[PDB]
Design a protein around this nucleic acid. Sequence first.
DNA 1: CCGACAGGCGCATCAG
DNA 2: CTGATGCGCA
DNA 3: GTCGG
Length: 326
Amino acid sequence: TLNGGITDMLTELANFEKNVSQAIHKYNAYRKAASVIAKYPHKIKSGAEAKKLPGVGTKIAEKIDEFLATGKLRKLEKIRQDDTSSSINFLTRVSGIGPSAARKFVDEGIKTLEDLRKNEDKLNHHQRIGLKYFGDFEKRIPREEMLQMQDIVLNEVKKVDSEYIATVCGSFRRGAESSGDMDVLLTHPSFTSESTKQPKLLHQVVEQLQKVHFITDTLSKGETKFMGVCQLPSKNDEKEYPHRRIDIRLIPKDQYYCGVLYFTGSDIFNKNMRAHALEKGFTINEYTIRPLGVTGVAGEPLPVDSEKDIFDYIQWKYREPKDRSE
DNA sequence: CCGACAGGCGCATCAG
DNA sequence: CTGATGCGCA
DNA sequence: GTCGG
Ligand SMILES: Cc1cn([C@H]2C[C@H](O)[C@@H](COP(=O)(O)OP(=O)(O)OP(=O)(O)O)O2)c(=O)[nH]c1=O
Ligand SMILES: [Ca+2]
Ligand SMILES: [Ca+2]
Ligand SMILES: [Ca+2]
Ligand SMILES: [Ca+2]
Ligand SMILES: [Ca+2]
């Protein structure tokens, strides 16, 4: 809230570039700016003051100038009244409709929740589930409920095979008091970078979670990654809990820390960490950290036995999950 | 100035 | 059918 | 939209 007006403003423009301009690099640029301003511990008095931050430049500065003086932004007022823009922006709030489909729907006269709800035959499976649980997917998950979802998931995973480890990552592991969804990192000794000795390792976990009515829906599902919906059981004469987005990723056990670094986030922390490693001659994915030879070719994986080790290689002081939030 | 800008899984489509 | 490209999302 | 080489 310190520069809340400013970071709200920038985030809105970020969402505009992504969903309407389909300009993914302007999106990121505005998000980087937002991020850096949020962490800045003085009430910003001018654009010039903000320009001294990395990722804030000439044009965001002018925008901050206009906002400080008048309390709003002309470019945004216009965007707020452009019907098309607002309609394309709204439809992307549905899980499974990105900038492209949203623009296609709006060209065909589909602009509202009602339009969607009586054109189910035009949506793919994912888009349909997102529509179905549209309101639920935008409620946040209190940490108390995340703690119950974690208990179910670990216990059921345990029940399929005691050798599995499941770790709830995302904002939950960063200690947040509320979460947007649930991210589960799954490992098992039969799946490593060198061999897959059992098949259905992810499937059997999903199947067990569906069997106890915890996973209610499936958005997509391959061998290593599941994306879907889950729900806590409710007691008698109570309202049902909202349905919730759940992601489960099966990662090679020997690449656990690159993996858990990756799903712990935040999204911008990773982007800033991958972007900083690139500048120091490495590349990081969910799997490995590798060096970069002059040609742009990735060297062979470096040894890693902790989250901390990854931070060393790119000359960063270890930051606890709590301190990786935006 | 002007080239990247993080990286990859699953689903969907298109050319052959 | 592969293989390549784009989308939506993590 | 921003940066740094
Ligand atoms: C979406 C996204 C996720 N990630 C990583 C980091 C995230 O912690 C993880 C998935 O987390 P998410 O499920 O996106 O949740 P979150 O960490 O954003 O927190 P919230 O629930 O409050 O929205 O994957 C990226 O590196 N880049 C991205 O763009
Ligand atoms: Ca700057
Ligand atoms: Ca969406
Ligand atoms: Ca999450
Ligand atoms: Ca997620
Ligand atoms: Ca029900």
